[PDB]
Design a protein around this ligand. Structure first.
Ligand code: ADP
Ligand code: ARG
Ligand code: CL
Ligand code: MG
Length: 356
């Protein structure tokens, strides 16, 4: 590590202290004992502790605040990642090791809201990393194009329900883009947390979205992760949604080599998406229980569920519509993950029905 870097790190660490109102896991776990212990480390690709915490330092409002420039970062800066991963994922020790991929008995899933008075839509996604490629911050503009090439090709061989067209962000009309974002299909453009983590370089080169005409199956290309395999649709038919995602992933996995860590499961750019990389969500309306986003969040937390705005994380709820999903992704199976969301939603719906 050079000198200019340490200057910004020492300056960054101090900033986290003078932010009495900062509640990010970064501040909560980057002790002076942890800071000094690794701030002088660098990875084979030149990633430093600054490339890891820069986003959380510049955005005190972050909930986590860090990212892994390359797979090696997860271990080079273990002292910092390890405790953050443990806290977030509901308890993941140092000796712990994520379990083997297990979709589970899909047949055991049920409809989330029959009467259809609360649930608007259901969605489940996973994240994958192409072997041979580092994470965003370590990518060259040429690598974004290479990766875009590989993924688009592999997806052109999707058949039946999973058959669709790849739409590059480069050349996409502002109208088409804005609509796909507003319809909750396409990832938003320019996220401050990602920008400051240098995850958006050369934008929009190599970025794109693949999806079948129904747009119930989608693959985000080069946003936060190399790939994001999405399955979504209106209603609470979690069974179908999950089943579809499973089909897609198993198929895609037989064609593209994805990075998998003996301990962290499937590797991702961010620590909250490790392991199963699964975020099973629903856009739900709970008028009585959501009489204060805060009281709703306290309820959901008891079920290991997370609450997000209608347009995604770091956004507000629009017209009572909230994004509730399983928070944990590492330390449990795909099946267990999707189940925490299922079980959690079923109870909250009940609590809502009995609510005064
Ligand atoms: N259950 C859902 N129904 C419809 N859209 C969803 C659903 N869950 C999330 N979304 C949409 O996914 C997009 C990305 O949201 P974000 O919070 O970044 O989640 P992620 O990165 O895990 O996919 C946003 O448009 C959000 O509105
Ligand atoms: N997509 C994600 N990694 N979301 C969770 C972290 C988001 C942001 N870096 C924060 O810590 O607030
Ligand atoms: Cl994260
Ligand atoms: Mg996202």
């Amino acid at each position: 590590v050079d000198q200019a870097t340490l200057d910004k790190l020492e300056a960054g660490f101090k900033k986290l202290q003078e932010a009495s109102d900062c509640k990010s896991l970064l501040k909560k776990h980057l002790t002076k004992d942890v800071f000094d212990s690794i701030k002088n480390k660098k990875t084979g690709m030149g990633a430093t502790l600054l490339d890891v915490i820069q986003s959380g330092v510049e955005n005190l409002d972050s909930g986590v605040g860090i990212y892994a420039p390359d797979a090696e970062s997860y271990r080079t800066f273990g002292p910092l990642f390890d405790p953050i991963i443990d806290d977030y994922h509901g308890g993941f020790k140092l000796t712990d090791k994520h379990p083997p991929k297990q979709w589970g008995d899909i047949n055991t899933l049920v409809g989330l809201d029959p009467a259809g008075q609360f649930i608007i839509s259901t969605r489940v996604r996973c994240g994958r990393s192409l072997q041979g490629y580092p994470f965003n911050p370590c990518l060259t503009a040429e690598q974004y194009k290479e990766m875009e090439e590989k993924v688009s090709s592999t997806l052109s061989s999707m058949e039946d329900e999973l058959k669709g067209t790849y739409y590059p962000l480069t050349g996409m009309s502002k109208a088409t883009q804005q609509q796909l974002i507003d319809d909750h299909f396409l990832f938003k453009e320019g996220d401050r947390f990602l920008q400051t983590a240098n995850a958006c370089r050369y934008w929009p080169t190599g970025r794109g979205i693949f999806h079948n005409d129904a747009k119930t199956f989608l693959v985000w290309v080069n946003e936060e992760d190399h790939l994001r395999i999405i399955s979504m649709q209106k209603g609470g038919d979690l069974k179908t949604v999950y089943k579809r995602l499973v089909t897609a992933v198993d198929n895609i996995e037989s064609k593209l080599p994805f990075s998998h860590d003996d301990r962290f499961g499937f590797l991702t750019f961010a620590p909250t998406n490790l392991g199963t990389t699964m975020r099973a969500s629903v856009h739900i309306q709970l008028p009585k229980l959501a009489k204060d986003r805060k009281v709703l969040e306290d309820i959901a937390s008891k079920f290991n569920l997370q609450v997000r705005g209608t347009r995604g994380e770091h956004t507000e709820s629009e017209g009572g519509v909230y994004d509730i999903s399983n928070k944990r992704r590492l330390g449990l199976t795909e099946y267990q993950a999707v189940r925490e969301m299922q079980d959690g939603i079923l109870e909250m719906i009940r609590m809502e029905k009995a609510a005064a």
